[PDB]
Amino acid sequence: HKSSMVYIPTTKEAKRRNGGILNTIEEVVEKLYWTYYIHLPFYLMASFDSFFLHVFFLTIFSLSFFGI
């Protein structure tokens, strides 16, 4: 019972079709970036406020590290 629907494979399947540890490092970096990005309201700011808030947080972390 075939229909006119085009299916899209899960990312796991895409990697399996496309086949050491450096990629694992890159993906955990991506994971961390995803957490940081989604738990803050970046999807609702055009570009300027988002850029400004990024600089803000980066400055906070830099100053905290320098002090401690």
Binding site: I60, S64, G67
Partner: protein, 149 residues
């Protein structure tokens, strides 16, 4: 207000003054305070300046949010609240509820904690006590309800 206005007000829960009773609505006022301390300390000045800045900014922000704007930020029925601030709409105009008690207690404890550091300066001590008393508890009394100057 008259019968129709009260019916419009009572016909629907006020979405702009009901979240204050939900989960986490109390710990947020304490959490926004601990962040101001870590930011004004990051400025890098002497303790008394950091503490007075913290107390001042919290009180001013709280006032400008809960006391300055009148009405609902969206359409209610025909507005039905076109001349009431957010503080007066808490708990459908019932005074001295636990929420109102907590929001009264917060600035006093803020001053008590901050006092120990800038206590040795008369000007800072006077300014902080003046701003606390005159921009905190006073608008939140039961005698200043619906009082326009």
């Amino acid at each position: 207000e008259t019968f129709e206005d009260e019916n419009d007000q009572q016909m629907l829960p006020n979405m702009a003054a009901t979240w204050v009773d939900q989960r986490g609505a109390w710990l947020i006022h304490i959490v926004v305070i601990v962040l101001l301390r870590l930011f004004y300390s990051l400025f890098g000045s002497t303790p008394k300046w950091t503490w007075t800045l913290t107390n001042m900014t919290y009180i001013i922000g709280f006032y400008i949010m809960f006391h300055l704007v009148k009405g609902t930020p969206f359409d209610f029925n025909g507005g039905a609240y076109d001349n009431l601030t957010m503080w007066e709409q808490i708990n459908d105009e019932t005074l001295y509820t636990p929420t109102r008690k907590f929001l009264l207690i917060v600035p006093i404890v803020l001053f008590l904690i901050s006092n120990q550091y800038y206590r040795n300066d008369m000007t800072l001590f006077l300014s902080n006590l003046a701003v606390t008393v005159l921009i905190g508890v006073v608008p939140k009394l039961g005698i200043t309800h619906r009082l326009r100057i």
